[PDB]
Design a protein around this ligand. Structure first.
Ligand SMILES: O=[As](O)(O)C[C@@H](O)[C@H](O)[C@@H](O)C(O)O
Ligand code: NA
Ligand code: NA
Ligand code: NA
Ligand code: NA
Ligand code: NA
Ligand code: NA
Length: 245
């Protein structure tokens, strides 16, 4: 009982302010690094895990760019425009609700870089509302960029940026279920809400919040010019194997 998940939500609506010196006017998610748009790398790893439909969330004004990404990869999807980018990536996630056609689906940040085997342990049909991809592998990640997770067995105990006890990093990849959308009304929406804050709220409201381990898979989040290096280029090469991105 390991079932493939055919659908993924990909969040591709951030500014990418810290990478502006490299990307200029173009949002980092649609800028090419090693010859593919950054957003294509998590999309390809998800397609290599059986995903066949994306809900791609972009900022107001980039529908075209989102559509080109889907055409290029030859994959089905719908592009959804986010008119409130200042409400954070939790808002980008809650926007996807009307568009999702499955009970259980992947969610990935459009700037999380990971190879297809990172998701190998994500397929257990166990009981959960959220399952976060976590890793201890830290050679690539900037530990100021990733949120930190205290895990006991496979449960999230606590999660955030400034937490004083933690054993894993949040990779920006998740398995979500439709029950997660019921948290949309639990925030005031007068300030930016991050996805890790949604997980912390899930724990605080009695949901089952679990993790799957990336194990030894190379992974990172691309936020600043200093995240780009030879090891990241070799991870991009790996993800693109056998694909004209
Ligand atoms: O992908 As998460 O770390 O769960 C939440 C993301 O929204 C947050 O904005 C980032 O700072 C992140 O990297 O922590
Ligand atoms: Na990010
Ligand atoms: Na542990
Ligand atoms: Na549900
Ligand atoms: Na937050
Ligand atoms: Na944040
Ligand atoms: Na890993």
């Amino acid at each position: 009982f390991q079932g493939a998940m055919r659908e993924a939500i990909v969040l591709a609506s951030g500014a990418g302010k810290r990478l502006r010196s490299v990307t200029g006017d173009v949002p980092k998610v649609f800028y090419r690094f090693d010859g593919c748009e950054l957003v294509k790398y998590p999309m390809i790893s998800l397609m290599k895990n059986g995903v066949e439909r994306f809900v791609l969330v972009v900022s107001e004004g980039y529908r075209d760019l989102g559509e080109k990404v889907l055409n290029d990869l030859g994959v089905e999807g719908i592009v959804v425009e986010n008119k409130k980018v200042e409400l954070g990536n939790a808002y980008s996630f809650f926007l996807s609700e009307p568009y999702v056609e499955s009970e259980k689906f992947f969610l990935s940040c459009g700037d999380s870089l990971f190879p297809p085997s990172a998701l190998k342990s994500a397929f257990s049909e166990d009981e959960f509302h959220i399952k976060l991809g976590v890793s201890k592998r830290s050679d690539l990640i900037d530990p100021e960029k990733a949120s930190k997770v205290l895990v006991n067995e496979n449960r999230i105990v606590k999660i955030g940026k400034r937490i004083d006890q933690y054993n894993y990093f949040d990779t920006g990849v998740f398995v979500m279920t439709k029950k997660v959308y019921s948290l949309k009304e639990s925030f005031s929406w007068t300030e930016d809400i991050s996805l890790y804050h949604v997980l912390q709220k899930a724990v605080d409201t009695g949901m089952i919040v679990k993790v799957f381990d990336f194990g030894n898979a190379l992974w990172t989040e691309i936020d600043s010019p200093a995240d780009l290096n030879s090891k990241v280029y070799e991870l991009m090469s790996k993800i693109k194997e056998g694909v004209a991105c």
